[PDB]
Design a protein around this ligand. Structure first.
Ligand SMILES: [Ca+2]
Ligand SMILES: [Ca+2]
Ligand SMILES: [Ca+2]
Length: 434
């Protein structure tokens, strides 16, 4: 956590912006949380900051004999004396879904019930380091995720899966269009070896896009190898990559990368709410993270890294549109942005799409297109990274990007065009870094 904090610039968000996630509530659905009691017996990283602790997988027992869920929550918001999570003043809703058999039987049949329970407890961010290795398929779970986000103010995050490095290995519900799906890059702890020596390396095991219908997943990356975080007092050494002390230890996976981003979302959401006067929609939080993310060096578009590694301080200050307009087929929204040639210009369009059928060969329902015009007339189409940048249109993703490394100082025109919106109208968010 301490090293990941610096990589994703949560350190700047905390030190220069005051953002520790105070006021925000993150829900974590995972194995269990240390002793499983919300009292003084609880691990120092969470004691006193738990909104609710629910036992779903094993009635009357939310403890963590595995260690996975405790480490994960610790990365989101742990507030121990050491190895803090990214949003150490956020409060925790924890839903224990591990069953007696070691599986995830506490999940309800309808995932919407899971998210609703968390919502009623006050959580507005819901993070899930779990999934099924269905090679990019959009399942019932994926559908329910999408349905829920379109209808409710919940930002939902899912791990990409650990089946890399082959392409098309994204887990469900990580295949959901409306979730923030997170892959793992390496932490920088090179004394531990090749799995933690280059922050611009995708971790070998991180699942890789595209999804089954060709979409870019994961959406973003964060350090996920040799992550030092809260160690459940009931978990054995075998659960860890390495020991540290009796209260913290190392783990590695997309399960570790996802909560780092979840805590960053809590920091980001706090910023909008406290400092920017608005409650940002899940689609804006997602757009802001994408626009601020760093190309780890593979270029775009790319299912190994998605849109890149979270860089939180750039996301904080984006120029935005927060679902303030909705569009029907053939309509368009127009904005203008004065750019500065000194630094790159990144514009990202995200929408919380209507949920797909599990039998559709194409999951996108409503298709919006991003069209950018530079001061001198040059036009760019969302996700077209090959020159000429206006001849390849995107009909698959509900994230579209125009990224210009050496922008012209001057006013850029931004169009959001409704190409085909059968379940309309469709709103959207925009985030602009420059
Ligand atoms: Ca490496
Ligand atoms: Ca499009
Ligand atoms: Ca092109």
């Amino acid at each position: 956590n301490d090293v990941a904090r610096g990589i994703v610039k949560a350190d700047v968000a905390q030190s220069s912006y005051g953002l520790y996630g105070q006021g925000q509530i993150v829900a974590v659905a995972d194995t269990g949380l240390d002793t499983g009691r919300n009292d003084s017996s609880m691990h120092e990283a969470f004691r006193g900051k738990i909104t609710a602790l629910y036992a779903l997988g094993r009635t009357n027992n939310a403890n963590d004999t595995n260690g996975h869920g405790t480490h994960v929550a610790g990365s989101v918001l742990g507030n121990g004396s050491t190895n803090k999570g990214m949003a150490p003043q956020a409060n925790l809703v924890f839903q224990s879904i591990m069953d007696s058999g070691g599986g995830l039987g506490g999940l309800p049949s309808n995932l919407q019930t899971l998210f609703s329970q968390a919502y009623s407890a006050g959580a507005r961010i819901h993070t899930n380091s779990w999934g099924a290795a269905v090679n990019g398929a959009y399942t019932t779970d994926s559908r329910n995720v999408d349905d829920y986000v379109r209808k409710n103010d919940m930002t939902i995050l899912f791990a990409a899966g650990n089946e890399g490095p082959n392409g098309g290995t994204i887990s469900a519900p990580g295949t959901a269009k409306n979730a923030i799906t997170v892959g793992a890059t390496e932490n920088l702890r090179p004394s531990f070896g090749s799995y933690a020596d280059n922050i611009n390396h995708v971790a070998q095991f991180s699942s890789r896009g595209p999804t089954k219908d060709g979409r870019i997943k994961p959406d973003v990356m964060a350090p996920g190898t040799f992550i030092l975080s809260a160690r459940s007092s009931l978990a054995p050494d075998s659960s860890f990559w390495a020991n540290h002390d009796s209260k913290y230890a190392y783990m590695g996976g997309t399960s570790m990368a996802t909560p780092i981003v979840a805590g960053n979302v809590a920091q980001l959401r706090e910023h909008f709410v406290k400092n920017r006067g608005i409650t940002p929609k899940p689609s804006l939080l997602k757009a802001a993270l994408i626009a601020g993310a760093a190309d780890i060096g593979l270029g775009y578009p790319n299912g190994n890294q998605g849109w890149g590694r979270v860089t939180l301080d750039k996301s904080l200050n984006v120029a935005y549109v927060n679902e303030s307009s909705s569009l029907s087929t053939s309509q368009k929204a127009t904005y203008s942005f004065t750019a500065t040639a000194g630094k790159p210009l990144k514009i990202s369009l995200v929408w919380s799409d209507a949920p797909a059928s599990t039998t559709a060969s194409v999951t996108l329902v409503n298709d919006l297109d991003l069209v950018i015009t530079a001061p001198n007339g040059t036009q760019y189409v969302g996700n077209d990274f090959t020159s000429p940048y206006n001849d390849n249109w995107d009909g698959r993703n509900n994230v579209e990007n125009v990224f210009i490394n050496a922008p012209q100082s001057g006013t850029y025109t931004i169009e959001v065009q409704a190409y085909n919106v059968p379940v309309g109208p469709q709103t959207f968010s925009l985030a602009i870094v420059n």
